Structures are given as C-alpha cells and as structure tokens.
Amino acid sequence: TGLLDGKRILVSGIITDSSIAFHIARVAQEQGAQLVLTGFDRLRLIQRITDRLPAKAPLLELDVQNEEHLASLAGRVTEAIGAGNKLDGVVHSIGFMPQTGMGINPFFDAPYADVSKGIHISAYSYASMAKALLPIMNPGGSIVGMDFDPSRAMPAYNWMTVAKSALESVNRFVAREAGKYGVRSNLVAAGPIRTLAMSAIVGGALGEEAGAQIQLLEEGWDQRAPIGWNMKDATPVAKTVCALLSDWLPATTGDIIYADGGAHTQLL
Amino acid sequence: TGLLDGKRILVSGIITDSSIAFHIARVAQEQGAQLVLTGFDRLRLIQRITDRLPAKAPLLELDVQNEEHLASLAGRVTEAIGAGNKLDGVVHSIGFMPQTGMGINPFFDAPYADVSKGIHISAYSYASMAKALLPIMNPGGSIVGMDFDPSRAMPAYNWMTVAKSALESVNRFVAREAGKYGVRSNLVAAGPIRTLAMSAIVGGALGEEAGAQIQLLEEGWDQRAPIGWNMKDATPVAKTVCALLSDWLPATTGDIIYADGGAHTQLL
Amino acid sequence: TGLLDGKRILVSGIITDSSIAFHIARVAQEQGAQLVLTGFDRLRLIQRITDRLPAKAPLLELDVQNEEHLASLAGRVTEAIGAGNKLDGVVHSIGFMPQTGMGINPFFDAPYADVSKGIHISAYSYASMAKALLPIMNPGGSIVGMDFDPSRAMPAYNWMTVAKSALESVNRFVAREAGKYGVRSNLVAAGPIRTLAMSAIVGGALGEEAGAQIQLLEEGWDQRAPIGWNMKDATPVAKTVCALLSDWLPATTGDIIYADGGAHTQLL
Amino acid sequence: TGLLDGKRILVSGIITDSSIAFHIARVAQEQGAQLVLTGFDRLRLIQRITDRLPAKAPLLELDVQNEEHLASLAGRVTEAIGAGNKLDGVVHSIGFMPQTGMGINPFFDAPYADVSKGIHISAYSYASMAKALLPIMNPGGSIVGMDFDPSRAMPAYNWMTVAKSALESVNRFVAREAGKYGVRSNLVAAGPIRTLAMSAIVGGALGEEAGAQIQLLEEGWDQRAPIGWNMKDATPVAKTVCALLSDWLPATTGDIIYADGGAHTQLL
Ligand SMILES: NC(=O)c1ccc[n+]([C@@H]2O[C@H](COP(=O)([O-])OP(=O)(O)OC[C@H]3O[C@@H](n4cnc5c(N)ncnc54)[C@H](O)[C@@H]3O)[C@@H](O)[C@H]2O)c1
Ligand SMILES: NC(=O)c1ccc[n+]([C@@H]2O[C@H](COP(=O)([O-])OP(=O)(O)OC[C@H]3O[C@@H](n4cnc5c(N)ncnc54)[C@H](O)[C@@H]3O)[C@@H](O)[C@H]2O)c1
Ligand SMILES: NC(=O)c1ccc[n+]([C@@H]2O[C@H](COP(=O)([O-])OP(=O)(O)OC[C@H]3O[C@@H](n4cnc5c(N)ncnc54)[C@H](O)[C@@H]3O)[C@@H](O)[C@H]2O)c1
Ligand SMILES: NC(=O)c1ccc[n+]([C@@H]2O[C@H](COP(=O)([O-])OP(=O)(O)OC[C@H]3O[C@@H](n4cnc5c(N)ncnc54)[C@H](O)[C@@H]3O)[C@@H](O)[C@H]2O)c1
Ligand SMILES: O=C(Nc1cc(Cl)cc(Cl)c1)[C@H]1CC(=O)N(C2CCCCC2)C1
Ligand SMILES: O=C(Nc1cc(Cl)cc(Cl)c1)[C@H]1CC(=O)N(C2CCCCC2)C1
Ligand SMILES: O=C(Nc1cc(Cl)cc(Cl)c1)[C@H]1CC(=O)N(C2CCCCC2)C1
Ligand SMILES: O=C(Nc1cc(Cl)cc(Cl)c1)[C@H]1CC(=O)N(C2CCCCC2)C1
C-alpha cells in the first residue's frame, strides 16, 4: 500500500544523518521502495549512517568526477538489484562549491578552476548520472535532482547560484533524452534546510556576514511562505521527491517542483 | 491503500463524460476519496453523467455567479457529508468565455461585459469558492484549480488567456488566505484535452481559422513534449490533481504544476 | 537633437503634478516630442497642472469606461494634431481599483462589481486605447503602458495585482494587433513611486496595516536594488518610457521593461 | 546630437564583418561614441575588418581565458583612452562552445573539459571582464552582454544553452558588484542572426539535422514575432545594445532586454 511499492530506486548524496538524501531514502523505504545507495569518498562513514535506515540497502561508491566510476555504475547497480531487473527511479542529491565560490569571499575572486569543479559536481553530473543509468531504467521511471531557486541573485550563495542555474538548464535537456526511454526528469527546488554544513555556515564557517545573511534568508522564507517553512524538517522535501518518483505526476518532465512553503510565490 | 483514502473532496466542473473534472472525480474515487460534486444549471444531465462514476456522490447546485448559491454552499456541503465532518480537498474545474472573447472574433471586438463575465467565472470564482469552503476545510487540506499556461499569447484563445493570467494571480492570493487554515492552493496547468467543446472548436464552431490553429497547437504540443502528449487522455491530468490533493506535496502552495508532457520546457 | 524629435505622442494619465504621466510628458517634451494629453473627469484641474509642462499640449477628455469617448478619440486627436498627421506614440498611464479591492479590506471581501471596474480601467482599457488609436499611428510607432510587477503576491495590493497580471496578458495580445501596423506594444514595470495617493496610503488612507506594509516594501526595494531606488523620483521611469517611445528598442514588443533599480532580479 | 555623444565604450567580440559586435561598434560610432576594441587571437584579421568602421578605434588583444591579458587590460585601456579618462560602457559579445557541445553530437557525449571551456568563455568571462574594467568605469556607466534565451531547451544548441543559463545568473551577480560603482549590468537576448558561422551550421557544419533544426527555428521565429524577425539584419540588436549603453535606461540592471521581434512572448 506504499506510494513506491515494488519500485527500485537509486539514491545518491547521503553523507550525514541530516543530508536531504538521508530523509529521501527513509521516506522512500517507508513507502515500500527498494533502494540502492551511492556515496562519495567516505564509504565507512556512509555505511554506518545508512545502517539507521528502516531497511537494508546496498551502498556503491560514486565520485561523479571519476569517469571509471560512471562507466562501471550501471553494471554495479545491476549486480546489486539482480540481472534482469532495472531501476524505476534515480535521485541526484549532490552539490559542491569550493569556499572561494560561496560565502564572504568576493564574487569576482573565485578562480575559474574552483567554479568549474563546482559546476562539474553540481550541474554536469546530473547529465552524467542520467547517461549512466537511463540504459538500466524502466519505462515510467523518474529521475529527480535537488535545486535551490537561482532565478534571482542573493548574498553569499554566489557561484553555487550559477551552478544551480546551469542545473536547471541541464534538466531540460536530460528530459529530452530521458523521454526516449519513457522516463521523466525533474528538479525539486527546496527551501533552506539546516544540514550540518548550514549550521556550520550560520556559525560563521564561510565568514560572519554570510552566516548573518543566511539567518535573514531563513527568517524571511518562513515569513513569506503562506504555510510556513521549518528549516529543521526535511520530511516535506523528501515527500515531494517521492511524489515525483511515484506514478502520480506522469505528465511532468523537464520541470521544477517547489517544495519551499510557497515562499517563491510571495514578494513579502 | 488508496492515495486519497479517507479524504472528503468537493469536485466542481462536470458537465459531460469528457470533462476534465469527470476524470478527476473518477481517479479520486478509485483512490479512496469520498466526493461531493457541484454542477451548473443542467443538474438532470449532470446527475445522469455522474451515475457512471465508480461510487455514489451527492450533487449540489453551484452557479459561481450566484451569490445565494455561494452563501449557502458550505451549509449544503456539511449536510451532504455530515455534521462534524469537514472537507480535505476542493477542485475548481470551471471556465467560460463568451464567443466574442475567443475564436476568430477579433481580440479588440470583445465587449467588456463579455470579458468581465468570463473573468468572473474563470478567475474570480476561484477566490469565491475558497471563501465559501475554507471555513469547512481541515488542516492539511488542498484546493486545486485548472490552468492553461497563459505566459505567452497564442491564436484564438484571446481573452480566455487573459482570464487564466488573472487566475494565476488569484491563486497566489488564495494561498495566503488558505495558509491560515493549514490549507494549500495550487493550479494544474494541463496540456490540451479534447473535450466535447474542443472537438467542436476543431470542427469550426468558433471559426475555421481558430480550429486550424488549435490543430496546429495540438500537433506542436505532442512534438515538443519529451514524453509526448495525448490530447484524448485526461487521466494523466487527473492523476496530477490527485497528487496535489494528497499528502505528498505538503510544501507546495501558491504554485503551478504542469501536467503537459513537459511541452512548456521546450521551444521546439 | 532630442531623443523624440519630430514625434507626436499621446499621453494619458495625468491627474496631479506627481503623476508618473506628468513626468513622462515633461521628459518627452524636453526630448522634442509634440504631445496630445488625455484626462479623466477633472479637466479644469488637469489643464491647470499641465500648464506647468515645458510646452503647450492640447488636452482631450477620455474616460476609458465611456464607449462614446473611445469611439470619437481618434477623430479628436487628428483634429488636435492636424489632418494628414498621425501619432508615433501612445502612453497608457491609467489605473484604478476601488478601496474594497486594495488595502486592509480582506481579499475575499471585494465584490466582483468592484474588481470588474478595476480590471476594466486598469487592464481592458489598454486594449481599448490601442483599438482606438492604432488606425492613426505611423509605422515604427510605440504603445507603452505602466505595470507594477505582479508575478508574486504581496500584502494589500490584492486585486490590483490581479489587474496587473491581466494587463501583462493583454499587452502580449495588443502586440499581435499592433504588429500589423508596424507598431510595438510594451509595458514598463516601475518600482514604487510616491505619488500623492501613495503618501496617502502610507499615512493610512487604506488602513494602518497597509501603510506599514508599503513602507516595508519601499525600504526593501531600495535595499535589493543594486543601484538603489528613490521612490521620490519618477524621472528614471519617465526616461525608460521615452526609450521605448524612441527608435532605439525597435525589436522589442509584447514585453516588459523593468525600471525598478534591478530589485526584481535580487531575492535579498 | 548622437545617443552616445562623449561616451567612451569598450567593444569585445569582433571577428568578422558579420559579427554582432561589428554592428554594435558601427552603430555606437554613428551615435558619437569613442571606442576601444578588443580581439581574440587573429589581430591582423580583426584590424583589417575594423578598418571599415566609420571611425578609428584602438584594438587591444584579449583572450578571456588568459589571466595575464585580464590583469593588464585596464592599464592597456587607460593607455588607449588617456590617463584621467575612464570608460562609460563595456560590451561583452563573446561566446564559444566546442563542437562536442553543440550540433548533432549527442548531449550526453560532450566531455566536461569541453563544456567547461565553453562555460569559461561564454559565462565566467562576463564576470572576469567586469572585474577587470569596473575600476576604470564612470558612474552612470553600463555593461552589456549578449544572450540567446535559454529558458527552454531546443535542438542542437545543447551545452551552449546551459552556458547561456549560467551567463544570465552571472549577470545578476555582476549587477550587485557594478552597482557599487554606479554602473548597470544587463544582457540583450537577441533573435537568431546569420553570422558567417550560422550559415556554416545551416550548410551542415555541425551535422545535417542541426542545420535543418536551425532553419526551422529561424522560420518559426519570424512567424511568432509580432513585428517579424530578419535574421540577416543585426542593426535592431545593435540599436538595443546602444539603448542600454545610453542614459535612457537608468533604472534597469541585472536584467535581460529581448531584441527578438517579440517572439519569446508568443507561443505560436
Ligand atoms: N540544504 C539546503 O538548504 C538545500 C536547499 C535546496 C537544495 N539543496 C541541494 O540538495 C542537495 C543535497 O544537499 P544537502 O544540503 O543535503 O547537503 P549534503 O552535504 O548532505 O549533500 C551533498 C552531497 O553531495 C555529495 N558530493 C560532493 N561531491 C561529490 C562527488 N564528487 N561525487 C558524488 N557526490 C558528491 C556529498 O558527498 C554529499 O553527500 C544538493 O544538490 C544541494 O544543492 C540543499
Ligand atoms: N480542455 C482543455 O484543453 C483544457 C486545458 C487546460 C485547462 N483547462 C481548464 O480545465 C477546466 C475544465 O475545462 P474542461 O475542458 O473540462 O471543460 P468543461 O466544459 O467540461 O468544463 C467547464 C465547466 O465550467 C462549468 N461552468 C461554466 N459556467 C459556470 C458557472 N457559472 N458556475 C459554475 N460552473 C460553471 C461548466 O458547467 C463546466 O462544467 C477549465 O478551467 C478549463 O479552462 C482545459
Ligand atoms: N505609483 C506607483 O508606485 C506605481 C508603480 C508602478 C506602476 N504604476 C502605474 O502607473 C500608472 C499611473 O499611476 P500613478 O501612480 O501615476 O497614479 P495617478 O493617480 O497619478 O495616475 C492614475 C491615472 O488613472 C486615471 N484614471 C482613472 N480612472 C480613469 C478612467 N476611467 N479613464 C481614464 N483615466 C482614468 C486617473 O485620472 C489618473 O490620471 C498606473 O497604471 C499605475 O498602476 C504606479
Ligand atoms: N548569432 C546569433 O544568432 C546570436 C544570437 C543571440 C546571441 N548571440 C551571442 O552574441 C555574441 C556574439 O556572437 P556572434 O554570433 O556575433 O558570433 P561571432 O563568432 O562573430 O562572435 C563571437 C566572438 O567570441 C570571440 N571569442 C571566442 N573565444 C574567445 C576568447 N577566448 N577570448 C575572447 N573572445 C573570444 C570570438 O573571437 C568572436 O569574436 C555571443 O555571445 C553569442 O552567443 C548570438
Ligand atoms: O548553501 C546553502 N545555502 C546558502 C548558502 C549561502 Cl553561502 C548563502 C545562501 Cl543565501 C544560501 C544550501 C543550499 C545548497 O545548494 N547547499 C549545498 C549543500 C552541499 C554543498 C554545497 C552547497 C546548501
Ligand atoms: O479552449 C481551449 N483551448 C483553446 C481554444 C482556442 Cl479558441 C485557442 C487555443 Cl490555442 C486553445 C481549452 C482550454 C480552456 O481553457 N478551455 C475552456 C473550457 C471551458 C469553456 C472555456 C474554455 C478549453
Ligand atoms: O498602489 C500602489 N502600490 C501599492 C499599494 C498597496 Cl495597497 C500595496 C502595495 Cl505592496 C503597493 C501603487 C502601484 C499602482 O498600481 N498604483 C495605482 C495608482 C492609481 C490608482 C490605483 C493604484 C499605485
Ligand atoms: O549557435 C547559435 N545558434 C544555434 C545553434 C544551434 Cl547548433 C542550434 C540552435 Cl536552435 C541555435 C547562435 C547563438 C549563439 O550563442 N551563437 C554563438 C556564436 C559564437 C560561437 C558559439 C555560438 C550563435
């Protein structure tokens, strides 16, 4: 009776128990999905974290900047879910920008090598992952990535904003490719969520001014949101990702669904 | 195990078995919802049509231009669902524009009295219905209306486009009010669906040029849509409305969900 | 050497010396335009006000809700500018919403007759004026209307927001008609300008909460604007309207130009 | 009496007599601007081409991927225009994407090193150029870049679309920096212009299917445009850039002006 009963779904992006992807994985399992997880670099950590999920899920290594990892990924997934089985869903919950590209470091002072690394991981990899996994996805399947609305500039987010603008564009092209397989591609634009790192940035890890600006952003977001916004609760975001992974948004692709309390629809 | 198990939902807008609202009502009942229906003017017809739905549903009269109908509506709904029970969902699937405001009649030749009637029924009534029903809606509830993307002009749709632009604005304000009740408000922007009337317009009911332009629109829509678009199948639209009525998009309000095959994300 | 040398331009919307249209008219005359003015209801007042413009300009009566005024307008304009001469530009600087539709009166409590009057004057009349004047406009000509960005909801602006959403849609259709004459149609979306009435609303004319919200809006607008925003200075808006009336934006139509300090491009 | 009388403007991006920047430079000189030009790699060619401009203009070498060129640029400009003089305008008319990232090569088959080079030149360099030149720009000045509307996906444009989405984001952040200097930053989103290279792509240089799709795009663009679109005429685009360089859009920044015949406002 679960929303995702019988579905096989790959979830990337878990690194702590506060990762948005941890909550996506939890809700998906509560709703009957069978998962395969991917993790970057710290696999012992990630295994220990994902031991706390409701059900067992194989963990595979994936550095999206590593061409060998991407080239072997479909085979490794198929080994984990069984020959003759394919995926019904893929969750991209991956982002990175060097400190030069976010925070109080001036916008103009980010070297391109740093910006390029952030765009590789945060935007191009959405296409890389789709390339690798579409050949082992079933018709009716769904690829979902995580977005933070970049349509307006904001303090401190700087080149990560630019990376998210690129991601939104990439998603519209991935939809064209995915459609050939009967697969949808969409982003969920979430409101601000207090992951470990965000509390770190609020405590000043990227400069005092950036932390101050994020707290103002958070406060304004809840004010503007007609149904409010709880930055400590990723579950509403996770539910939205599961909606897109389900059979219930079958005519939506190349698109952005806003799980943000409605804040982006209100000026003040 | 239905998506809408236990939910009480009001559905407006059925007039034929090809009405988008007929399919919304059908899918909602398949998913366990208990419905109350509203109909305009031809109640004997509408009862005979809705006899074909999977389950029984009380039918109430509602002309959204009639202030007495709106003032009595909540009481009549409560009588139908039982004292002490409230609604969890409301579907607005209502639209109208006089022939002077659509088709081959020149854009400049639509008298304002005609445009005003179309905007009353197609846009203002979304607010009227929310005003009437929010006092008998439960927290966590959902109001959904039907949209046809008006962000660009198009042939023949003329003042109905303007009415839909107004509706989109109205929805953002209804979200502000609905949030006070813990209720969401959203639109579903559907691709073109061949209702009775649309085949009528294709057969030339509003002029030959308008019918020709609609057929070109339909053809282009399926071409652009990365997953295709079947104008003869309202079920994907109905499923999307049910997704918004469910618990699975809990952080989305004041917003527009596109159930259009992804066509609006592609230029060609 | 003026930007608008030799051009004949109709300017509507002057009612006080703080009207945005007064400043449009002033700047247009400084730049060599020959004007015809239209005014509503208080023609003795408007004549006394426009006596202060740099140059003489005939004043014609125009109530945009009056069909007889609209039907005679082109003939009256031609009489004022001389047989055989046509207009090169038209400025629509007209808006109205009854107090029930703006301010602290609840959104749901605005009667449709009031909303309909506001939409007639604020949105439909953009089409009415184009219908009346396109037959006496020269190729290369330009129609400009005034907008306040309605893409997100905001406190108190309420049904005027809805009217501006309608206007934006109307403009895209007027562009289709105007193009047949070689004429452009565009809106200028201005930041908040302290007209007489706005100081009145700040002093509480539409309720204390509305005045408080407008002051917060004004303050936020200047903060967000990368080049700042001076609500006491309409000249930057007037210059932008003159740019659209000129020969220098010849490939822009159906569009919106933002003269708002850049505020709409920034979240905070 | 020229629109840009007395203004000192840097124009990048000339490589042939069909370059959009060649036409920007020509119109700017016709309107009284004093120019400094920058060129990439083929300076003998570019000098011979720009000999045909109405007036003399110093040519400086600038490879935007070359950090030494960027670090010396302001000094070289100041030498060319005279100590104590500053720029009033900067035109970025620079774009590049390797063949793997455009045309018929599959979207998924573009290596990131190629995409990264295209984003460096086409998007990041807008920030690089602003960083280099803002210290020698006057208050009231204007930075303009060239855009091709990337809000929807399209055939063949592929990763260049993604680069333009990034550019639009970069422009909103450059506006924040430029505002500190009293300088505006905006993009002009042009319709398709038949430069040398575009005729090359139509003749099949990036594959037959891509050429076919571009011809369909061009045809549709003129159809949709309410005032038509002439792909052989860059002058309307050049005029629009000059409007933004002028004093007549003083409250517009972080924004996009569409010089596209109005096509983006029309669905069909
Ligand atoms: N936290 C928020 O406020 C917020 C808001 C909206 C969207 N998002 C997005 O949600 C997603 C998840 O972010 P989060 O806040 O949960 O943070 P997180 O740090 O928990 O997740 C980011 C993940 O990216 C992974 N990653 C980094 N480099 C990688 C590489 N080379 N290969 C593979 N994976 C790599 C990290 O290991 C980590 O698991 C990101 O796309 C982020 O931009 C976050
Ligand atoms: N058919 C499409 O291509 C399409 C596409 C997108 C959105 N829509 C929208 O979907 C909704 C339903 O349209 P449909 O195509 O199913 O057509 P339909 O004719 O079946 O439904 C329109 C309904 O509006 C009702 N209505 C008209 N005047 C009314 C009044 N005074 N009071 C109450 N109800 C009144 C009619 O009785 C009818 O039931 C409308 O909002 C329409 O604009 C339709
Ligand atoms: N003031 C701002 O903050 C602001 C911001 C953006 C846009 N605007 C828009 O600019 C325009 C001018 O507004 P303003 O602030 O200068 O106020 P204003 O009161 O000076 O101008 C409004 C004009 O509309 C006229 N009008 C009203 N009913 C009319 C009718 N029946 N026929 C003809 N004219 C009629 C009034 O006589 C008046 O001249 C309006 O469209 C307004 O919505 C204003
Ligand atoms: N042609 C169109 O249809 C069209 C439409 C909209 C926007 N645009 C944009 O207009 C701009 C100019 O394009 P165009 O069509 O005139 O083509 P073009 O080839 O004439 O201009 C592109 C320029 O970029 C320069 N460039 C490339 N690499 C460079 C580097 N490393 N450093 C400095 N300069 C470098 C080239 O030398 C050339 O002068 C580009 O941004 C393009 O994306 C073009
Ligand atoms: O960083 C975030 N918000 C934020 C940061 C700053 Cl410096 C300013 C603002 Cl306004 C918002 C949120 C949104 C986002 O994409 N992430 C990512 C999490 C993974 C590493 C890169 C950043 C966390
Ligand atoms: O009319 C429609 N499409 C359409 C019509 C025309 Cl004339 C042109 C175009 Cl492009 C599309 C579709 C979309 C829409 O809101 N309805 C409404 C159905 C109820 C009565 C008013 C119109 C049916
Ligand atoms: O009213 C205005 N701003 C405003 C009002 C309110 Cl109540 C709230 C907010 Cl946020 C902004 C500005 C913008 C606008 O269209 N006008 C119009 C001026 C003419 C009469 C109708 C209103 C003045
Ligand atoms: O390439 C163009 N259009 C185009 C190409 C393709 Cl392959 C498809 C489509 Cl739809 C449009 C136009 C738009 C654009 O940014 N340039 C750039 C010119 C300089 C080199 C990189 C491309 C030329």
PDB file of C-alpha atoms in Angstrom, chain D residues 9-118:
ATOM      1  CA  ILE D   9      32.970  52.390 -24.821  1.00  0.00           C
ATOM      2  CA  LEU D  10      34.895  49.134 -24.994  1.00  0.00           C
ATOM      3  CA  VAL D  11      33.560  46.594 -27.515  1.00  0.00           C
ATOM      4  CA  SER D  12      34.724  42.991 -27.496  1.00  0.00           C
ATOM      5  CA  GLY D  13      33.785  40.203 -29.866  1.00  0.00           C
ATOM      6  CA  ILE D  14      34.525  41.325 -33.439  1.00  0.00           C
ATOM      7  CA  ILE D  15      35.937  38.546 -35.613  1.00  0.00           C
ATOM      8  CA  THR D  16      34.165  39.086 -38.987  1.00  0.00           C
ATOM      9  CA  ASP D  17      32.170  41.814 -40.682  1.00  0.00           C
ATOM     10  CA  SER D  18      29.038  39.811 -39.755  1.00  0.00           C
ATOM     11  CA  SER D  19      29.820  39.694 -36.018  1.00  0.00           C
ATOM     12  CA  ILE D  20      27.041  41.171 -33.916  1.00  0.00           C
ATOM     13  CA  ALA D  21      29.779  43.238 -32.243  1.00  0.00           C
ATOM     14  CA  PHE D  22      30.813  44.754 -35.575  1.00  0.00           C
ATOM     15  CA  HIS D  23      27.318  46.168 -35.923  1.00  0.00           C
ATOM     16  CA  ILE D  24      27.255  47.304 -32.276  1.00  0.00           C
ATOM     17  CA  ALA D  25      30.542  49.153 -32.859  1.00  0.00           C
ATOM     18  CA  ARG D  26      29.281  50.720 -36.091  1.00  0.00           C
ATOM     19  CA  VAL D  27      26.020  51.998 -34.604  1.00  0.00           C
ATOM     20  CA  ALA D  28      27.790  53.219 -31.463  1.00  0.00           C
ATOM     21  CA  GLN D  29      30.226  55.273 -33.588  1.00  0.00           C
ATOM     22  CA  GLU D  30      27.355  56.643 -35.715  1.00  0.00           C
ATOM     23  CA  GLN D  31      25.883  57.815 -32.406  1.00  0.00           C
ATOM     24  CA  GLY D  32      29.036  59.602 -31.299  1.00  0.00           C
ATOM     25  CA  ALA D  33      30.757  57.031 -29.099  1.00  0.00           C
ATOM     26  CA  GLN D  34      34.539  56.805 -28.920  1.00  0.00           C
ATOM     27  CA  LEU D  35      35.546  53.143 -28.962  1.00  0.00           C
ATOM     28  CA  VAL D  36      38.277  50.834 -27.811  1.00  0.00           C
ATOM     29  CA  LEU D  37      38.044  47.354 -29.359  1.00  0.00           C
ATOM     30  CA  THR D  38      39.267  44.005 -28.056  1.00  0.00           C
ATOM     31  CA  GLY D  39      40.003  40.970 -30.153  1.00  0.00           C
ATOM     32  CA  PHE D  40      40.959  37.334 -29.763  1.00  0.00           C
ATOM     33  CA  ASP D  41      43.903  35.613 -31.430  1.00  0.00           C
ATOM     34  CA  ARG D  42      43.611  36.875 -35.031  1.00  0.00           C
ATOM     35  CA  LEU D  43      44.519  40.514 -34.538  1.00  0.00           C
ATOM     36  CA  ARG D  44      45.697  41.152 -38.117  1.00  0.00           C
ATOM     37  CA  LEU D  45      42.317  39.920 -39.393  1.00  0.00           C
ATOM     38  CA  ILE D  46      40.392  41.917 -36.828  1.00  0.00           C
ATOM     39  CA  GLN D  47      42.297  45.117 -37.596  1.00  0.00           C
ATOM     40  CA  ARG D  48      41.578  44.730 -41.323  1.00  0.00           C
ATOM     41  CA  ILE D  49      37.873  44.160 -40.574  1.00  0.00           C
ATOM     42  CA  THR D  50      37.575  47.097 -38.190  1.00  0.00           C
ATOM     43  CA  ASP D  51      39.308  49.439 -40.658  1.00  0.00           C
ATOM     44  CA  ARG D  52      35.835  49.528 -42.254  1.00  0.00           C
ATOM     45  CA  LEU D  53      34.195  51.061 -39.177  1.00  0.00           C
ATOM     46  CA  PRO D  54      33.189  54.751 -39.575  1.00  0.00           C
ATOM     47  CA  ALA D  55      35.904  55.940 -37.184  1.00  0.00           C
ATOM     48  CA  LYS D  56      39.295  54.913 -35.847  1.00  0.00           C
ATOM     49  CA  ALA D  57      39.371  52.743 -32.757  1.00  0.00           C
ATOM     50  CA  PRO D  58      42.385  51.236 -30.972  1.00  0.00           C
ATOM     51  CA  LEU D  59      42.460  47.421 -30.945  1.00  0.00           C
ATOM     52  CA  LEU D  60      43.686  45.553 -27.886  1.00  0.00           C
ATOM     53  CA  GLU D  61      44.308  41.821 -27.556  1.00  0.00           C
ATOM     54  CA  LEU D  62      42.109  39.943 -25.097  1.00  0.00           C
ATOM     55  CA  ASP D  63      41.841  36.189 -24.671  1.00  0.00           C
ATOM     56  CA  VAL D  64      39.396  35.916 -21.777  1.00  0.00           C
ATOM     57  CA  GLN D  65      40.968  32.589 -20.733  1.00  0.00           C
ATOM     58  CA  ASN D  66      44.329  34.328 -20.323  1.00  0.00           C
ATOM     59  CA  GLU D  67      44.838  35.675 -16.797  1.00  0.00           C
ATOM     60  CA  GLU D  68      47.741  37.910 -17.866  1.00  0.00           C
ATOM     61  CA  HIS D  69      45.585  39.584 -20.520  1.00  0.00           C
ATOM     62  CA  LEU D  70      42.865  40.272 -17.967  1.00  0.00           C
ATOM     63  CA  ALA D  71      45.325  41.571 -15.354  1.00  0.00           C
ATOM     64  CA  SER D  72      46.824  44.069 -17.818  1.00  0.00           C
ATOM     65  CA  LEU D  73      43.599  45.045 -19.568  1.00  0.00           C
ATOM     66  CA  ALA D  74      42.585  48.110 -17.530  1.00  0.00           C
ATOM     67  CA  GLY D  75      46.076  49.587 -17.885  1.00  0.00           C
ATOM     68  CA  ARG D  76      46.100  48.971 -21.607  1.00  0.00           C
ATOM     69  CA  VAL D  77      42.657  50.536 -21.975  1.00  0.00           C
ATOM     70  CA  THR D  78      43.715  53.581 -19.951  1.00  0.00           C
ATOM     71  CA  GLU D  79      46.778  53.988 -22.164  1.00  0.00           C
ATOM     72  CA  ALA D  80      44.500  53.907 -25.234  1.00  0.00           C
ATOM     73  CA  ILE D  81      41.925  56.441 -23.950  1.00  0.00           C
ATOM     74  CA  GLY D  82      44.299  58.671 -21.980  1.00  0.00           C
ATOM     75  CA  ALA D  83      45.231  58.930 -18.328  1.00  0.00           C
ATOM     76  CA  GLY D  84      42.463  60.500 -16.279  1.00  0.00           C
ATOM     77  CA  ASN D  85      39.782  59.198 -18.649  1.00  0.00           C
ATOM     78  CA  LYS D  86      37.524  56.253 -17.824  1.00  0.00           C
ATOM     79  CA  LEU D  87      35.050  54.080 -19.708  1.00  0.00           C
ATOM     80  CA  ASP D  88      31.320  54.709 -19.798  1.00  0.00           C
ATOM     81  CA  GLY D  89      30.460  51.381 -21.391  1.00  0.00           C
ATOM     82  CA  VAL D  90      31.575  47.799 -21.901  1.00  0.00           C
ATOM     83  CA  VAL D  91      30.155  45.348 -24.452  1.00  0.00           C
ATOM     84  CA  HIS D  92      30.691  41.627 -23.975  1.00  0.00           C
ATOM     85  CA  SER D  93      29.922  39.905 -27.288  1.00  0.00           C
ATOM     86  CA  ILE D  94      31.875  36.703 -26.690  1.00  0.00           C
ATOM     87  CA  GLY D  95      30.773  33.091 -26.910  1.00  0.00           C
ATOM     88  CA  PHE D  96      32.218  29.690 -27.740  1.00  0.00           C
ATOM     89  CA  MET D  97      31.350  26.013 -27.346  1.00  0.00           C
ATOM     90  CA  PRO D  98      33.372  23.115 -28.779  1.00  0.00           C
ATOM     91  CA  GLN D  99      31.652  21.064 -31.457  1.00  0.00           C
ATOM     92  CA  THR D 100      31.132  18.213 -29.000  1.00  0.00           C
ATOM     93  CA  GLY D 101      28.800  20.514 -27.033  1.00  0.00           C
ATOM     94  CA  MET D 102      26.609  21.756 -29.906  1.00  0.00           C
ATOM     95  CA  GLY D 103      25.160  20.340 -33.098  1.00  0.00           C
ATOM     96  CA  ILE D 104      24.242  16.711 -33.720  1.00  0.00           C
ATOM     97  CA  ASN D 105      26.798  15.239 -31.284  1.00  0.00           C
ATOM     98  CA  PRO D 106      24.640  13.695 -28.550  1.00  0.00           C
ATOM     99  CA  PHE D 107      24.083  15.879 -25.473  1.00  0.00           C
ATOM    100  CA  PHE D 108      25.456  13.134 -23.207  1.00  0.00           C
ATOM    101  CA  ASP D 109      28.638  12.715 -25.260  1.00  0.00           C
ATOM    102  CA  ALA D 110      30.150  16.170 -24.565  1.00  0.00           C
ATOM    103  CA  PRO D 111      33.200  15.689 -22.289  1.00  0.00           C
ATOM    104  CA  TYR D 112      33.247  18.017 -19.320  1.00  0.00           C
ATOM    105  CA  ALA D 113      36.600  19.559 -20.354  1.00  0.00           C
ATOM    106  CA  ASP D 114      34.830  20.804 -23.498  1.00  0.00           C
ATOM    107  CA  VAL D 115      31.730  22.039 -21.655  1.00  0.00           C
ATOM    108  CA  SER D 116      33.968  23.741 -19.084  1.00  0.00           C
ATOM    109  CA  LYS D 117      35.883  25.615 -21.811  1.00  0.00           C
ATOM    110  CA  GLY D 118      32.587  26.822 -23.295  1.00  0.00           C
TER     111      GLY D 118
END
